[PDB]
Amino acid sequence: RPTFYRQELNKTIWEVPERYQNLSPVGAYGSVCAAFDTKTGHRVAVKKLSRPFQSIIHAKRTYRELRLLKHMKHENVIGLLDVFTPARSLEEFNDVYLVTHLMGADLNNIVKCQKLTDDHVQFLIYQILRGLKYIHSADIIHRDLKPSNLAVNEDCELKILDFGLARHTDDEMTGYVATRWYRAPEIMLNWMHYNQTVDIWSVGCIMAELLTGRTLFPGTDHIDQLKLILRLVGTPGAELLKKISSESARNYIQSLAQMPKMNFANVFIGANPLAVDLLEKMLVLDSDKRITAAQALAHAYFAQYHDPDDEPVADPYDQSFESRDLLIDEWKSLTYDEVISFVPPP
Ligand SMILES: Cc1n[nH]c(=O)nc1Nc1ccc(C(C)C)cc1
Ligand SMILES: [Cl-]
Ligand SMILES: [Cl-]
Ligand SMILES: [Cl-]
Ligand SMILES: [Cl-]
Ligand SMILES: [Mg+2]
Structure with a gap:
């Protein structure tokens, strides 16, 4: 586990790992800060989800977004650089933060x-x-x-x-x-x-x-x-x-x-x-x-850009959860598992 530090930016508490520095507010899904990621050297966008588990529809939407972002690994698609929570257990789990490349x-x-x-x-x-x-x-x-x-x-x-x-x-x-x-x-x-x-x-x-x-x-x-x-x-x-x-x-x-x-x-x-x-x-x-x-x-x-050896396809993506009926706590526990199993890209 990394060390987290807390700060208040525009009436919101941000608790993030030390690797993220110089947070600056940038913009109903959540609040976003621009930051510098000292691990990768990229400027990144950090999004703190607003009330991610307030209802069944919201908890399932949180899981959907996280599953989708974890899957996308392509030069022309936004991917997930990091995901984290300050919670140390499922029982105190409440907040989810998503990290992506910052877009100009x-x-x-x-x-x-x-x-x-x-x-x-x-x-x-x-x-x-x-x-x-x-x-x-x-x-x-x-x-x-x-x-x-x-x-x-x-x-x-x-x-x-x-x-x-x-x-x-x-x-x-x-x-x-x-x-x-x-x-x-x-x-x-x-x-x-x-x-x-x-x-x-x-x-x-x-x-x-x-x-x-x-x-x-x-x-x-x-x-x-x-x-x-x-x-x-x-x-x-x-x-x-x-x-x-x-x-x-x-x-x-x-x-x-x-x-x-x-x-x-x-x-x-x-x-x-x-x-x-x-x-x-x-x-x-x-x-x-x-x-x-x-x-x-x-x-x-x-004709001047097409290269059939450099237009790759995706790994299969299991969407069976979309037809599944679960309680809030169950959607929340599935989301916790995806947070802690995240492995960063190379
Ligand atoms: C392709 C197709 N297949 N099933 C169907 O129910 N409707 C289809 N097309 C469709 C195309 C245009 C419109 C409006 C916009 C004129 C409605 C249905
Ligand atoms: Cl860190
Ligand atoms: Cl939390
Ligand atoms: Cl537009
Ligand atoms: Cl899958
Ligand atoms: Mg948009």
């Missing part, structure tokens, strides 16, 4: 403030798809891909962060909000179950924005956004309509005048024809027909 800019900071060449777009989207190939190979769905969840450094290197933990609420998705602008239309009103093709829709929305500098579907509400989407990609054809099982979806959809898919070369004026072709393969209304991450890596648009 996100893709928002860059999209708003840079002139991006086609070469910049190629490299940024290539890295998203390389990380997504890894995530999807473990049968994980991110669910919340958007520019503020992509970290980028001065060398244009990118990491995916902030996995959807089933945390976003109804009010968080209401109105003119970036929280919803990147979500696939078949899940915006829960007409279909979540599946990994929804992440590819989000990548298409991000790629379009990098190309034009503008949000692709900046809807003022769920319905306005659906209208923007259907104008670009068309209303459902007969083949897709056969597959639509939600009666709610069918009733409303059939009230809309039919529209053809638009010509993407007239929407994304001046873009590389290969980037237009890839966008057409991501932004397909029928999610069965969307390109996958593994398929997209072999698209000609990435």
Whole structure:
């Protein structure tokens, strides 16, 4: 066990190992401090979870986040540098701290403030798809891909962060909000179950924005956004309509005048024809027909970065706990076990 020291920063007590120095507050899930890690020499983000075991839903969400972060070991995905508690036994266990690499800019900071060449777009989207190939190979769905969840450094290197933990609420998705602008239309009103093709829709929305500098579907509400989407990609054809099982979806959809898919070369004026072709393969209304991450890596648009010997897959990830029903103390004890079994990376 390391030695811990205590301090109060903005009305919160932080009790952390001596290896973490120069804590500075940075920003409902918890409070975050930037710090210097004297073991690894990295600047890190230290998050103290708020009330991690207050309810069954909260205790299970704490376990979910910790299991997910412990699993991710990929250059283009946020990983777990450390996890700790000041408790010396399960019986006094109450607080959980998570440590990750500190992130400077996100893709928002860059999209708003840079002139991006086609070469910049190629490299940024290539890295998203390389990380997504890894995530999807473990049968994980991110669910919340958007520019503020992509970290980028001065060398244009990118990491995916902030996995959807089933945390976003109804009010968080209401109105003119970036929280919803990147979500696939078949899940915006829960007409279909979540599946990994929804992440590819989000990548298409991000790629379009990098190309034009503008949000692709900046809807003022769920319905306005659906209208923007259907104008670009068309209303459902007969083949897709056969597959639509939600009666709610069918009733409303059939009230809309039919529209053809638009010509993407007239929407994304001046873009590389290969980037237009890839966008057409991501932004397909029928999610069965969307390109996958593994398929997209072999698209000609990435010819200068694609290396099939350096695009690795993940160890299998056991998610059986998601269908399990336990008490608070049992979720809490499973979380304690994962804290004390953590082994740092090399
Ligand atoms: C592919 C698919 N499979 N099953 C289903 O129930 N619904 C599906 N797609 C679907 C596509 C679009 C829409 C709205 C956005 C027009 C709804 C369902
Ligand atoms: Cl220490
Ligand atoms: Cl504690
Ligand atoms: Cl965002
Ligand atoms: Cl596992
Ligand atoms: Mg975020």
